[PDB]
Ligand binder design. Structure first.
Ligand SMILES: Cc1cccn2c(=O)c3cc(C(=O)NCc4cccnc4)c(N)[n+](C[C@H]4CCCO4)c3nc12
Ligand SMILES: Cc1cccn2c(=O)c3cc(C(=O)NCc4cccnc4)c(N)[n+](C[C@H]4CCCO4)c3nc12
Ligand SMILES: Cc1cccn2c(=O)c3cc(C(=O)NCc4cccnc4)c(N)[n+](C[C@H]4CCCO4)c3nc12
Lengths: 496, 497
């Protein structure tokens, strides 16, 4: 099974309305920059972002020039001439539209409320897909809360039904229409819907975990934003999942959700695999094509794990563009984010940066000794370890934000495709290091065990192991005369 | 409101069929030993035990001579001439009949299964009560499991309906027929039904907690079997309630059920009070009229919290009767249980025992220095603190097992009545000590708190407190943009006035 390679294509409305493929000053990353070689290295392009309007329907930004928008999408779907497996998805949501404090948040809550609203919203998704020529629907609601999850589920189920019927109607058995979501990659947002992961993922082809932004100006201690494994010297976090409305016992919560823990990519993946009904092949690991920069950091450890003075507000509440050498930061008016393309040029232009490597997290980072700056980012080296992880854990593939942040040669995308598909690349001896692994155990990743069959009428001592109804159970205290599952005394510890 | 004083009267079928009041070798504790003075000190006598037969009806042991049974019960109900508040209850169950491996266990599970079976069983309970002259029904099922609790509750409700109708029919408004159960006194058995305590206790007049046997030879470390409060120097136990099917979060389970914890009487009472809908006035504290003995006790502990070499297997797997001076242990053939009557007779007959006192647990214990023996028991002094606890916590009263283990003068029963009712007893200055209290917090004992009202649209930092929909909530982490109760981020920590 070929690994998915899902690249976001993001274009703001102003750039759509003024679209041109011959002037990077207006449109920095036109569709023409996606060469045939790059199209062949992708399996999915997530066009972004559409929204949910006050009519509770999928819709473009109301300021969008529809004729210019159709032309942009047509240029993307023309790329399928170079890659018969390529799908041009469209994404609904993103942080700006759909976060709790976002401009359109209430429309997401209201669209999934009722059977009538869900049917109307689901129909509009398929309509938009067919009217503009997209190959599937991606929903990036960041993020539905506990009371909204069941409606969110039924809406996804409704879209799945309509997409499957549309696949048959259009003869698309060879390339069926698909449904994906961007899912939270950290435990705090994940706890909103974690208990219902199985019913969320059931109608999806993939859940694309946003396993980045695990550090940012909203945290007082600098850190890697997409550490693969944990560094004991770095900060640790409250494991919010132990508070999810799971109904598990104290022992089950404790063994599944050690706290505090290292907020890493491996943690997010393992937390998903701990849940019953979440298959590894549907889990896609997100990676960032951008870095996050911090100022006012101290010395002694390359700027890692230090206090900082980076503004947290949105948008950037100043004109102080303090990321030395970041020309894109001036154009975008924000020194806290830098594309890999810009970071590469900052490393090549003598601005005082050093590129350092953390062999526990398996991620690079920049340090500016003279102005106290720290940048966490990913590159082709960190992608070696993440690609091997994807293969070892039998995940569905990789996702990234976004195509316009790769360098001009497309080195990041080419690296991902190479690590998955190149016949002359061999990572069998790649050293995954001694960084901290997430060691939680849950119902979905219980180890295989053997035990004598449970015998009704037997009195079991503390620590006894029995097999019953497909699982191996252990007594939590002594003098146990009840059957596993009928009591508080038995802990499910294994399967088969 | 007078505190309940509930004494079990237990008599085996063998003793009923051969009942006599002039031969202690056949019947050691005849009803005649319950003098008018003792009858006035009781509010309830739990006659025990009846059973549930394979027809799923309340019934006497099939080997019971029915005429002899009626005669024994009549001697108990005649005691009401001396005490117009006294009730002769009858108890269905007990350990032998109703434990998971007991001879009649399946009858208890099956009787509560369906509306028809519950109706048939409930009718048989009231029929037995009226036929033999009892004043109420007590059910000692030890213990219903999670899947059986809902049927068990519906059966209790059905008995409640029939008892209330029988009260009206018999003009017994001045002394209505009552319904009680014996409940678990330790967290392990309690976890079976803990989540449904409110609906279990609703149809009852009392739930009589079996707050004894909290220690015994089956434990590797000697301990008090009915410690009122905890001793930090003593052993601690897994808090099984954190594994009950409550649906609470990790923070809520941890805050309600500290673990490990001291297995005490106070723990069991407070664990019941942590649940909403469980009124203190229905909780009755059980006390033992017997002791538990250990050997091999090695230490300067006074024998407390020490390793031991006591069998604690049943039945006693030896003939070594090493409890020096326990003659009842020889006749009964078990050196690990002794009535208070015998323990007193061991103390006054020169056997080398020292009576020591633990001022944390507020319980006495025996220690035999030359042979290293340890006995945990209760007496009139430990009952002072338990009686004051009952009054301070506004509990319903006290229960004890059993009447035949008191001394001949009835000193234990007289002490309980004195501490509740005597005008010349004054425990106002009795110091309850510094033993460990159970400090768990649950929905039934959330404190009143004050906090600013939650404001929609606000982003809250970690540890922020807000009031919302009748509760005070605290954030467990930062950058909170959700409303309390809609999220995993908010912890219920208090109630709004
Ligand atoms: C406050 C905050 C707290 C915790 C997490 N947070 C984010 O995880 C986050 C992500 C994003 C984001 O867009 N990631 C890329 C992306 C790509 C594709 C789809 N979805 C998202 C974001 N813009 N912000 C707000 C920034 C903007 C300036 C300062 O705060 C975010 N804030 C927070
Ligand atoms: C209250 C009590 C009263 C009287 C006797 N008692 C015991 O003789 C006893 C033995 C044991 C025990 O473990 N024996 C060893 C063993 C282990 C496994 C298989 N066969 C034998 C025990 N755990 N408890 C506590 C209760 C609490 C919940 C369930 O058990 C016991 N309680 C009591
Ligand atoms: C084996 C055992 C294991 C776990 C718990 N167990 C008891 O909780 C228990 C209680 C009683 C009992 O009667 N408590 C007083 C009473 C008063 C009113 C209503 N119900 C009960 C008991 N007799 N045994 C038998 C044992 C004891 C030693 C040899 O045989 C019991 N055994 C066990």
């Amino acid at each position: 099974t070929r690994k998915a390679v899902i690249g976001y294509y993001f274009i703001p409305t102003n750039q759509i309305n003024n679209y041109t493929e011959t002037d990077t000053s207006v449109v920095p990353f036109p569709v023409s920059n996606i060469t045939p070689a790059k199209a062949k290295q992708l399996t999915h392009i997530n066009f972004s972002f559409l929204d949910i309007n006050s009519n509770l329907e999928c819709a473009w930004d109301p300021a969008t020039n529809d004729a210019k928008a159709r032309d942009v999408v047509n240029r993307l779907t023309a790329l399928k001439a170079h890659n018969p497996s390529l799908r041009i998805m469209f994404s609904i949501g993103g942080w700006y539209y759909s976060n709790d404090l976002g401009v359109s948040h209430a429309n997401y809550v209201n669209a999934v409320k009722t059977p009538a609203s869900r049917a109307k919203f689901a129909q509009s998704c398929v309509r938009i897909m067919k009217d503009y020529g997209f190959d599937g629907v991606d929903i990036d609601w960041e993020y539905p809360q506990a009371a909204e999850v069941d409606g969110f589920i039924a809406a996804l189920q409704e879209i799945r039904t309509l997409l499957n019927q549309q696949t048959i109607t259009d003869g698309r058995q060879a390339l069926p229409y698909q449904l994906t979501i961007a899912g939270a990659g950290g435990a705090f947002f994940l706890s909103r819907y974690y208990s219902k992961l199985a019913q969320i993922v059931a109608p999806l082809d993939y859940i694309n975990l946003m396993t980045y932004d695990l550090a940012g100006p909203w945290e007082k201690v600098t850190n890697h934003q997409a550490a693969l494994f944990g560094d004991a010297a770095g900060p640790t976090f409250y494991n919010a999942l132990r508070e999810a409305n799971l109904g598990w016992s104290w022992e089950e919560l404790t063994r599944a959700f050690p706290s505090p823990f290292s907020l890493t990519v491996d943690a997010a993946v393992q937390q998903h695999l701990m849940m019953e009904g979440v298959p590894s092949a549907k889990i896609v690991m997100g990676v960032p094509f951008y870095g996050r920069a911090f100022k006012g950091v101290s010395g002694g450890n390359g700027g890692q794990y230090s206090s900082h003075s980076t503004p947290g507000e949105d948008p950037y509440p100043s004109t102080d563009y303090w990321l030395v050498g970041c020309e894109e930061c001036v154009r975008d008016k924000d020194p806290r984010i830098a594309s890999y393309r810009q970071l590469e040029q900052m490393l090549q232009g003598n601005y005082g940066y050093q590129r350092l490597w953390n062999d526990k997290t398996k991620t690079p980072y920049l340090y500016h000794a003279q102005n106290g700056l720290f940048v966490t980012y990913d590159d082709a080296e960190s992608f070696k370890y993440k690609a091997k992880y994807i293969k070892q854990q039998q995940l569905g593939g990789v996702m990234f934000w976004h195509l316009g942040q790769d360098n001009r040669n497309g080195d990041l995308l080419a690296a991902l495709d190479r690590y998955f598909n190149a016949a002359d690349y061999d990572d069998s001896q790649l050293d995954m290091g001694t960084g901290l692994r997430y060691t939680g155990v849950g119902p979905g990743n219980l180890p295989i065990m053997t035990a004598p069959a449970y015998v009704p009428g037997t009195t079991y001592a503390q620590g006894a192991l029995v097999s019953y109804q497909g699982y191996v159970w252990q007594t939590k205290w002594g003098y146990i005369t009840s059957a596993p599952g009928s009591d508080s005394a038995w802990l499910k510890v294994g399967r088969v």
